[PDB]
Every structure is written in structure tokens, then in C-alpha cells.
């Protein structure tokens, strides 16, 4: 397959492009409620669906932002014109968007606020929006210069086995301050299981349960119903 690479190297090269982009965007769209991307090559076109919570701030004035970003990508990876085309998308339900929830906590913190109240505000929101449970940690300095941790926890959580891959999403964010750095971690547990999306599989968190319909009666007595 000249001049392209063999099949082993083919998937690796895709991953490198997927990864560079995913950190490139995050350093200039964080405040506009970045939440990821989802790329899809289609015949004679690349689609890069720039998932973000609030499409307002994404658009800018006369679609300016989307135009700047497309011209960059068109040069960096050296594609000729008419290939890359960005599109935006609004994600419904933000309480499952750990990445964006973490970056909301970031700007609330950088706004100048205490840690407990900020964490509480983020907590109830993601719980209210619909979640099994949720957790926030903030480890680093505050009120001294020995480090500490403050854990704020509600609901259910899992930590072991393969279900961890389905039922939680996890984000990590560094946030700066004038004196030292603080580490944020957010872990949120997704609510869907049998009915809805359908997506998540049946196994329950850490006690796998059976759901059993009811009915068992008779009324029989001798009769023939001739048709």
C-alpha cells in the first residue's frame, strides 16, 4: 500500500493524530465548555465534531472561531483544501460530562472562592441531572503549606472489576494559583442500565441482580370451547 504505511503502523498513526488534536483543542476551548471531540472520516471529507456544552461561546461573531480553527488544521497536518471541515454540537445533560464539570470547577476556583462551597455546588448539580453517585477530591495546599485532601462523596461508586470501564467517567485537571498548584479529580457514575439508552449492559455495580416478573394462577375446570 504505497506510499502509506503497513497495517500495524496504520492504527498507531491514527491514534497519534487523535491524541495531539484532543490536547490542542483543550487548551483554547476549555472556557467555552469543551467536552471532547469525535472525529469521523467519511468519503472525501473529515468531520471533526467539536462537542461542547454551550454552542453560543463556541460560535463567536459570525462563525469566526470555527473558521480560524479549520485553517490551522488544514496546514498543520498538511491536508489540501476541502478536506477538514469542523462542525459544532451541543450535548444534552451536562451532569454526565465529567470533563466539562471539572473545567467548570476550575474556573470557579480561579474565580476566587473556598473549596468546600465550590465542591458542593458542582456536586448537587451533577447528582440532580441524574447520576448514581459522584465524587470530587481536591488535593493540594490551602490554609497552611502542608498539603491536604478534602473528599466530598454522595451516592454509589465502584472501583474494582471491568464495570469501571462502562459506568464511570473520570477527569483530572490541574489548576494554578499564585502560591502552588491544586489537583482536581472528578469521578461520576452514569445512571443508565436496563431501560435507556439502551447502551449500558445489565450487570449492577457490585451486586449483580435479577429482576423477576410476577404471575402464576390457574382457573381451570372441565369445559370444551368448540370453534
Amino acid at each position: 500500500m504505497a506510499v502509506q504505511i503497513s497495517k500495524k503502523r496504520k492504527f498507531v498513526a491514527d491514534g497519534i493524530f487523535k491524541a495531539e488534536l484532543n490536547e490542542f483543542l483543550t487548551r483554547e476551548l476549555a472556557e467555552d465548555g469543551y467536552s471532547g471531540v469525535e472525529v469521523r472520516v467519511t468519503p472525501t471529507r473529515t468531520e471533526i465534531i467539536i462537542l461542547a456544552t454551550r454552542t453560543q461561546n463556541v460560535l463567536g461573531e459570525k462563525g469566526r472561531r470555527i473558521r480560524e480553527l479549520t485553517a490551522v488544521v488544514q496546514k498543520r497536518f498538511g491536508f489540501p483544501e476541502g478536506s477538514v471541515e469542523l462542525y459544532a454540537e451541543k450535548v444534552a445533560t451536562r451532569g454526565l460530562c465529567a470533563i466539562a464539570q471539572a473545567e467548570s470547577l476550575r474556573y470557579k476556583l480561579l474565580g476566587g472562592l473556598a473549596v468546600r462551597r465550590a465542591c458542593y455546588g458542582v456536586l448537587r448539580f451533577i447528582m440532580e441531572s441524574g447520576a448514581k453517585g459522584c465524587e470530587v477530591v481536591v488535593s493540594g495546599k490551602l490554609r497552611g503549606q502542608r498539603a491536604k485532601s478534602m473528599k466530598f462523596v454522595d451516592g454509589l461508586m465502584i472501583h474494582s472489576g471491568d464495570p469501571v470501564n462502562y459506568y464511570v467517567d473520570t477527569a483530572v485537571r490541574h489548576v494554578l494559583l499564585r502560591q502552588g498548584v491544586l489537583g482536581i479529580k472528578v469521578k461520576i457514575m452514569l445512571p443508565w442500565d436496563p431501560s435507556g439508552k439502551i447502551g449500558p449492559k445489565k450487570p449492577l455495580p457490585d451486586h449483580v441482580s435479577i429482576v423477576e416478573p410476577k404471575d402464576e394462577i390457574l382457573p381451570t375446570t372441565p369445559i370444551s370451547e368448540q370453534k
Binding site: 436496563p194 445489565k202 449483580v208 441482580s209 429482576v211 423477576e212 410476577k214 402464576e216
Partner: protein, 63 residues
């Protein structure tokens, strides 16, 4: 051997024998296929255990 049945098995086993009492044999294979049909079981291996205990209960309940 080792291994004592977990609480998830003994809890749900009781429910399943109670409400479908007249739908159980005293054979493993029949009681297996029944549990698959009258209820969701999230695994196959889990089913093969819960069936076997449902069977073991049904032996004593007739005494």
C-alpha cells in the same frame, strides 16, 4: 473445595422459587432454562449457580 454461595444467590433464589413454585422440577437442566425465560439473568455463569440452589431448595420444601 471451598466456596459458600454469596448473598446475591441466596437472596434472589428465594424470590424465584416462591412465585414460580409450580414451574420447577427437581432436575437441574429444566430449572435452568426456566430461570432464563421467566426473568433476565445478567450472565450465563450466574444463572448456572442460581438455578442449582433453586433446585436444592425445592428438594427440601417438599418435606
Amino acid at each position: 473445595m471451598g466456596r459458600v454461595r454469596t448473598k446475591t444467590v441466596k437472596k434472589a433464589a428465594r424470590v424465584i422459587i416462591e412465585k414460580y413454585y409450580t414451574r420447577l422440577g427437581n432436575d437441574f437442566h429444566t430449572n435452568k432454562r426456566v430461570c432464563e425465560e421467566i426473568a433476565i439473568i445478567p450472565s450465563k455463569k450466574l444463572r448456572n449457580k442460581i438455578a442449582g440452589y433453586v433446585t436444592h431448595l425445592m428438594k427440601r420444601i417438599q418435606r
